Design a protein around this ligand. Sequence first.
Ligand code: FAD
Ligand code: LDP
Length: 440
Amino acid sequence: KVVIIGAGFAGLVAARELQTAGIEYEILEAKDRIGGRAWTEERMGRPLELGATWVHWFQAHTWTEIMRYGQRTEITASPSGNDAHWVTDGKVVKGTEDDLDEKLTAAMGVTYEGSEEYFPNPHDPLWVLSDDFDGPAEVRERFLSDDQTNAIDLVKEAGFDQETIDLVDAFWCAGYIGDPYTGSALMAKQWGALSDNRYRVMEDITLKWKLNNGMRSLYDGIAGDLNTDIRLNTPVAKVEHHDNGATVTTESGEVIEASAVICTVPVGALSNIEFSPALPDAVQSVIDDKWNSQGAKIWIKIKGHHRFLGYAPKPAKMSVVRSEYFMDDDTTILVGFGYDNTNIDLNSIEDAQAVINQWRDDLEVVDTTGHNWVADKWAGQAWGTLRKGQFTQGWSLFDDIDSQLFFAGSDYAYGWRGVSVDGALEKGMTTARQVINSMR
Ligand SMILES: Cc1cc2nc3c(=O)[nH]c(=O)nc-3n(C[C@H](O)[C@H](O)[C@H](O)COP(=O)(O)OP(=O)(O)OC[C@H]3O[C@@H](n4cnc5c(N)ncnc54)[C@H](O)[C@@H]3O)c2cc1C
Ligand SMILES: NCCc1ccc(O)c(O)c1
């Protein structure tokens, strides 16, 4: 009787949690596939992650699933010690990956500033605004001010030179997967807090360890535990929600009565669903504005074996590009993150060559691929990231619903919110507990 909308990680783990509690559920998924914004698929001669890729044992929810489904030793680190290239004042500078990481490390010290005062428990991100806050008034003032400041301006205001500004510009075009200048610096500070306030840990957690058997070994594992078949090709068109239950209408017009609805549809796709009554004004403002995830992820194949790292600031097609696989036919597959899905065609060899040409003139693209999540009706974004003001008046507002409609998904997590499968597994599970506790 609980209707779960979406068979991504949040919906899958919510279903398994309800099953443990003996609560009847049904998952309605719009696509002909499960996994959502995690999607492992054979492309260009090997399995590639069209979305979620990296994991770490400091991510509690992701790591427990890795252990559960047999993947404990099935992780491999991305290539390191690459030849680094970065664009700063319209020119390419070359150095070692260590050289680049040293410059980023110094910049992150200033970027994280305040995280120890804001986030003593890094899983209580809004503690500063709670009745339990006991620090000085100036800490709350700076906290609210930091929600209206982007992460690049912090580095500018600290007097770093143009090279470091261009490096963090590139870095946060990837990290905010969108225009970093519209973003909330509090997101970066909480990443620091969850990473022991050290750049190397933050990169170890978010950009190092890959699953040999893909995210699909995890989402297929969870679905394999479910005793109720997932209803694929069943998009939800309408949710009527009240204090004692809900009514869901599918695209085909099927009406399904529910004791509760767990909605995992991301903000970028919520406009496909009619809500009755309308969602609160403050939540609608977030949906209208959207998150700060307008960017895109590409996979590029070049001739030869090349250990390559490239950084480029806005408005480049791609801001962070790195070698990921050395193939048996003398080619290299690289990953890339960009700030603007509309400035690159992920499947155009000419655009992929333009990306590589940002740094080198001697590397030849032979293949390219990707899925433009922002142009995907059922996503409408990449990973969720925060605009100015959305740390304190954004993701947490989706919990302020009186009815039996519950919003779950990575974008509303307390921890590795938006950016990580960890946040989807966190919030899917805890939202199921909200439903369980209410029924108990
Ligand atoms: C490019 C990219 C790279 C990423 N890389 C990483 C990484 O390296 N590491 C990491 O930990 N995380 C990564 N992530 C984040 C991770 O993919 C997400 O945090 C997580 O997968 C989101 O899960 P979810 O269940 O909250 O949402 P989703 O996966 O979006 O699930 C929502 C589901 O609802 C379905 N749906 C939508 N609308 C409807 C409707 N009307 N009716 C029915 N069903 C509907 C969708 O098809 C989808 O299956 C990445 C994300 C992107 C976009
Ligand atoms: N999977 C992307 C997560 C990510 C992307 C870019 C960054 O610069 C970063 O620290 C983290």
